[PDB]
Amino acid sequence: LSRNATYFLGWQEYEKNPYHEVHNTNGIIQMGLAENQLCFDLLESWLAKNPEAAAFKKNGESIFAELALFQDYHGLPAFKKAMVDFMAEIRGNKVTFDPNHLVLTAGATSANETFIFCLADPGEAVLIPTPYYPGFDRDLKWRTGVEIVPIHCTSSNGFQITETALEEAYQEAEKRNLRVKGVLVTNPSNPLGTTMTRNELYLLLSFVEDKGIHLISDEIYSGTAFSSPSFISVMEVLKDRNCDENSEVWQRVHVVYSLSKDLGLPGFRVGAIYSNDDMVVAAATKMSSFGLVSSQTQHLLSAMLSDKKLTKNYIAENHKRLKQRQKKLVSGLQKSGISCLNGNAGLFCWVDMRHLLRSNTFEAEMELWKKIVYEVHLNISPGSSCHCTEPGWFRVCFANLPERTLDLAMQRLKAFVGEYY
Amino acid sequence: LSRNATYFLGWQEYEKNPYHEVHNTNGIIQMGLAENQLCFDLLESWLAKNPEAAAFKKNGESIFAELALFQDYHGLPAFKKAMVDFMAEIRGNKVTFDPNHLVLTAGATSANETFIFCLADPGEAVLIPTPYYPGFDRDLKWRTGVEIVPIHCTSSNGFQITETALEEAYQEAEKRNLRVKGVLVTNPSNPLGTTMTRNELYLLLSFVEDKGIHLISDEIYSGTAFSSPSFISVMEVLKDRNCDENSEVWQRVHVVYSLSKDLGLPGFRVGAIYSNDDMVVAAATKMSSFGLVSSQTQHLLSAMLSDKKLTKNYIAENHKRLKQRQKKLVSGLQKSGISCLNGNAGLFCWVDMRHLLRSNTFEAEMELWKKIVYEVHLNISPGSSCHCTEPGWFRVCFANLPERTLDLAMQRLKAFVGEYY
Ligand SMILES: Cc1ncc(COP(=O)(O)O)c(CNOCC[S@@+](C)C[C@H]2O[C@@H](n3cnc4c(N)ncnc43)[C@H](O)[C@@H]2O)c1O
Ligand SMILES: Cc1ncc(COP(=O)(O)O)c(CNOCC[S@@+](C)C[C@H]2O[C@@H](n3cnc4c(N)ncnc43)[C@H](O)[C@@H]2O)c1O
The missing domain is CATH 3.90.1150.10 (Aspartate Aminotransferase, domain 1)
Known part of the structure; x- marks a missing residue:
């Protein structure tokens, strides 16, 4: 084997x-x-x-055959539209998503691995703030040959990401002879239970810009921010800045989403990849073939x-x-x-x-x-x-x-x- | 990228x-x-x-919450049982499948790639009889780093696999400096439209036994054999022979199945992996995490x-x-x-x-x-x-x-x- x-x-x-x-x-x-x-x-x-949707009926008519046959990896048009509308609503409509840049996957588990496959080659690495979701150790590295280098966070400042922690992480990767392709963050954070701060976000965007790497934001908990400070999507920070399709980092900021935690439907396997990079969307779309969402x-x-x-x-x-x-x-x-x-x-x-x-x-x-x-x-x-x-x-x-x-x-x-x- | x-x-x-x-x-x-x-x-x-199943009801009771939460990669027990029963029925109940050895995946597309991930390392290869389903060129090689070496079949003998074609394939792999890990066949065949012959099967089992490699049989069309000669699953041939848990090849014969072609439900993404090797089942089960079937x-x-x-x-x-x-x-x-x-x-x-x-x-x-x-x-x-x-x-x-x-x-x-x- x-x-x-x-x-x-x-x-x-x-x-x-x-x-x-x-x-x-x-x-x-x-x-x-x-x-x-x-x-x-x-x-x-x-x-x-x-009761009609679950009954394979639309306007009184059966659409079972049509759904049974729908296997296009571009995803169901009406569903992708509903998803981008929902993602925007979650973010107080402060940001809009193009359904043509959204890629459906079998859960965020699938989406995260696919992003790694599209952004890093075997032997390269991604930086991840600690503590982090332990599922990442398998999801992100197992079949990708990619390694994880930690960006250490401590209780001193509420476990926030600092400029020094990022450079030390970037330095550890170098010492391990690993080429860094990006940073993957969870916002809101699992297991911290905190929303990332605007400060941390700009700090991250500045870092990925400097190093010319990617920023992947796993925002599966974006809809569960129930108290101040406000939740800020990585996509929002890009808009209110020269990164608004006026830089390069814009193309290297990506988001992962899922309906597993807010709606509580992990069994249905509804995940999503969103990227401004046309090539990443095209690549991920083809990759979704290995993990499509049931029609x-x-x-x-x-x-x-x-x-x-x-x-x-x-x-x-x-x-x-x-x-x-x-x-x-x-x-x-x-x-x-x-x-x-x-x-x-x-x-x-x-x-x-x-x-x-x-x-x-x-x-x-x-x-x-x-x-x-x-x-x-x-x-x-x-x-x-x-x-x-x-x-x-x-x-x-x-x-x-x-x-x-x-x-x-x-x-x-x-x-x-x-x-x- | x-x-x-x-x-x-x-x-x-x-x-x-x-x-x-x-x-x-x-x-x-x-x-x-x-x-x-x-x-x-x-x-x-x-x-x-x-109407109850599609309505998230069982015996008059709602089971929406239970299904919404079911995300176990071992798959729904009742569903795996129904699947093995169906696979046996398709084969005239001539062979039985252990539900504990079945792994659900998002379509056969997902199942085939997962099998490659579990059986061959990047740089190695699998032999495939030509002509073959062109989807394999991407499905089997893209993210696996594995190569395909053709086992040429011609009209002379109805496009059947011969001992000489297998050795020539095995020889081409060597010339390309590729280590062979197995043979993947489609039975019944896409695009031939023919069921594999008992002769071809024994020929394949003998070959994989000799070379100490794997045999993966994509039997997604197994239920569509409508005329003589009879369809023979690779699993049946193992039983009526010393391979019946009395050899080694038994552990290296695997099957891929799906509900996309017989039932015509490709959009639902129902695929399955079946293997007698405990380790392959364990590995594939974890891999299914990236492409589970909606509960x-x-x-x-x-x-x-x-x-x-x-x-x-x-x-x-x-x-x-x-x-x-x-x-x-x-x-x-x-x-x-x-x-x-x-x-x-x-x-x-x-x-x-x-x-x-x-x-x-x-x-x-x-x-x-x-x-x-x-x-x-x-x-x-x-x-x-x-x-x-x-x-x-x-x-x-x-x-x-x-x-x-x-x-x-x-x-x-x-x-x-x-x-x-
Ligand atoms: C930050 C963050 N991102 C993504 C996800 C995954 O959510 P999706 O449901 O959209 O994929 C999570 C949370 N994940 O919580 C559930 C873990 S499952 C979906 C995947 C994960 O769990 C391992 N595992 C172990 N035992 C498992 C059984 N019995 N079934 C399924 N998965 C199982 C897997 O190996 C994998 O790493 C999140 O916090
Ligand atoms: C022998 C054989 N085995 C397996 C399969 C796959 O069946 P599943 O539905 O169970 O996965 C087939 C037949 N596959 O026929 C449909 C091809 S799709 C499922 C996968 C395949 O097609 C490419 N592709 C190209 N354009 C696509 C769009 N628009 N949507 C989805 N897939 C699309 C993919 O890149 C992939 O290689 C079979 O014969």
Whole structure:
């Protein structure tokens, strides 16, 4: 077989003994799965009121044959139009997207890998701010032969990207004899739970301009920014500057999007690539061939997203319920004397548990982590799994479980800190 | 951008002037698109009688949230079970498939590339019998860095694979300094329209055993074998031999399947990988992450395929209508004094038009091809596009257009041969 052919304790323990309000009340509570189960009722109500799309019907007529045959990698026109409209709405209509520059893919997972395939050759690299979504270690490197060089961020400044961290990253790549092709960021951030600052964005654009490299912004959480400071898409910063089709960096700024986190439809595999570079769009379009979005799904979501009443109310309501749940987690944690990095987006909080470590080491972090799993029966993510340089931080999700289960988790954790500390 | 980032006349002319019974009767008739539009009515009737699956309902209950959240790359259990049952039924239940060894992918396009990623490293190669599906030149090589070495087949023996052709292929690879990792075949064959013979299969199994390489059988057309000789899956040949988990080749024989051609649902992107090798299944499962099948689609098709009455009648009816349409094309061609390679499967015929060429050259072939496009307003595929070693053969599809349009095409072609020959 080829070479390609050849932190899990929390989950393996979870599957063996999963928590359930009635069938297993002693099970481990899931707080490490970043999924949104807060607004399904809004989608179910829409589906009940508008049954035709899911029924393969349009204006009373059957379009099953037409959809069954639609396999064009340019994507369904009506669906791409609805998607760009939705992406603009998410950004307060401060930026518009050309549907001809959008490429549909089977989830952001597919989109990110495709971008790497189009922008870097095997042996080259991309810079990524730490901590970062651990899925990237496989998604971005596995079949691409591309390497990841970290741009270290620390708690000192709220885990923000600095000019010095970027140069040190660029320097590490050189020392490893790796040619840098770009920087990939997550905005809003997983696992930080914060929106990138305008300052960081200009800092990034200036850096990629100087180095003549690419900037890929994974904005899958763009619709989940529920509190100040405001979410700023990388595309917005380009407009209000000489980069507005008056520079070169404009062609090297790209966005990745998905319906997995805001709408909570990860199973449907709706991802999107957006680029101003005509050649990247052409290349990605052909690559999408290996991971197209089901035409049945494309039709359903074009109908849903074309409804301006649904999109408007969904975003507002999603923001409301997410904010409510995040505050509940923050308040719950405070009662145990546990603080969080001040966040305003995502489906999780970046929790500070440094003062609960035996010592300032990752060995201590894994120790604490295992205690929470076996003693507290809570599954969360140790920061080292996200490549955070300082031991003690944890990602704790809050949008996948019922409010009452969240409270249960908090009181068990409180019982824990009072018992061992 | 990376390197990856950087025969069409018939289609470009088609899009500019596409044929239509009422809106453009002088348009070019499409006979180069291998799609099945013969049995949509059977699927529409089932959907009308069983509306719950498409409605996200099971036993009267809504399962929208559950499906929306299902993103596991091991695939929906009920759907994989229905798929293996269907694959066995297609093969007359002569072979059974373990659902734990099946991996769902976004179409066979995705499945084939993934198999290449798991079996060969960049710089290595796979042998493929010519003529072959031109999509392979991009699908199998583009992002994999793998090369294709042809196993030449000629009309002398009905375009069958011979021991000598295999060794000559294996020899060409060596001369090009390429290490061979396996052979990929299409059974039934696109564009031949023939089922592989038991003789060819044993010949292939013996060859891959000797060379210690893999055998990948793309059986996407397995359900479209409508006439004798019988279709024989590569998996069947393994059973009735010492290869029945009593050898080594057993672990190196793999199958690719899809619902794009038999059921005519290419837009839904339902592909499948099947392998006896535990490691290949594990690897492919993780790779499917880049191209998963929409859970909405998985649910719908698990319901459809779980209905034994539908699957039985669909296969029988598909066989009937396909056979009827193929005979019509064969008879239509005979009237113009044009013969076809005796075939029994697929959605197309491999047509012999050598006697209509100015000379025995590919330049002559392209000449004739362009005449049929501009003079006859018919779009078919020149054999050279499929890498056929002898000029003059063409692939002509018959399952995508109405019977009357097919006849129209035949009479225009007859008018052509009588006018220039
Ligand atoms: C910043 C960021 N970007 C993109 C994504 C992916 O979202 P899409 O749904 O649009 O692709 C995420 C979040 N991803 O969360 C879910 C991870 S799955 C989609 C992909 C990922 O997970 C690994 N994995 C492990 N076990 C898996 C099972 N059982 N099924 C599927 N995937 C599974 C994969 O190997 C892969 O790396 C995000 O935060
Ligand atoms: C033997 C054989 N195996 C597999 C397949 C693929 O079937 P799936 O639908 O299960 O993936 C086929 C037949 N494929 O026929 C359709 C070709 S598409 C699925 C993929 C293929 O076509 C190229 N292409 C060119 N223009 C395209 C547009 N506009 N949309 C999609 N694909 C398009 C791609 O670059 C790719 O190589 C078969 O015979």
